[PDB]
Amino acid sequence: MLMPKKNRIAIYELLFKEGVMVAKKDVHMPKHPELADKNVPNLHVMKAMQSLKSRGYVKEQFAWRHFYWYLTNEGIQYLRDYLHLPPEIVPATLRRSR
Amino acid sequence: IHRIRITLTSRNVKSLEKVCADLIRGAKEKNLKVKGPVRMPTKTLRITTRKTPCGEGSKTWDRFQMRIHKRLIDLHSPSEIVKQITSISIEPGVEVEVTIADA
Amino acid sequence: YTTPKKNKHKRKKVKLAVLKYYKVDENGKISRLRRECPSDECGAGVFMASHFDRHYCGKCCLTYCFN
């Protein structure tokens, strides 16, 4: 996957700040609907977390035409080493409420 | 004191006749002038399907339908005391939508 | 299984070794060789081409027909 570096970190840092992210299964979409700011299309985000599933860093599920993803405990420690974050920052799924 | 119109939409009548009667005596107990439940004509939605996944068969169609019941209540109340009349009966099949008075 | 041409072999980049756009003289002399681009994205940044006639910036694709 060609996928420039600015186009990659902006997917992972939203895949880190929430433990999940949801993309639609169509490769012909100009922008990702939630991201929509760094000019990232739906084809890069579908091929980001195909690399993470093959490395076990994420878990997927596919309802009708939407991929959903979930950080595993291996993926949390990897994103704290690739995004270069201090070893106390957690995703929102670990603690927001009680 | 306003002239407000509550609209009640549902898909089953026995779950709507309980909610709509709750709003009537709920405002007859709180001494308001309530125009009664006005019943709109229902809306049946009649998708008809071939029933077969392939094209082979004896051409047996499949008539699905869904009636939509809509009843409306017109009140004579200010904007405050209707809120505890509105928020005491959800009954999830009923979508209580309260409009505004002046319009 | 027709085989009219058998191959349409893909482009290979000619892989030039070093950078070497500048020069050096009298123990220190700044001297460009290729033209710079006047665009805002690469002003005094990347260089323009030097073809048989023209100059051409590879980033913003504008070229000037050197007649």
């Binding site: 009708w64 035409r65 | 998708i47 399907t49 029933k51 499949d62 008539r63 699905f64 869904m66 | -």
Partner: protein, 55 residues
């Protein structure tokens, strides 16, 4: 790629730009009332949407 002719044919009007919301198929589609499903995937979710075969 490339970008100018990868998906350049206009997927406006026509059944090449209408897909089932469940199974992404382009034949036998029901677009009435904003269903936008196929005619077979409707019959799985006919009761879950809330249609009743009364007659």
């Amino acid at each position: 790629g490339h970008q100018q002719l990868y998906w350049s044919h206009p997927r406006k009007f026509g059944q090449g730009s209408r897909s089932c919301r469940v199974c992404s198929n382009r034949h036998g589609l029901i677009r009435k009332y904003g269903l936008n499903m196929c005619r077979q995937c409707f019959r799985q979710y006919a009761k879950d949407i809330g249609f009743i075969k009364l007659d």
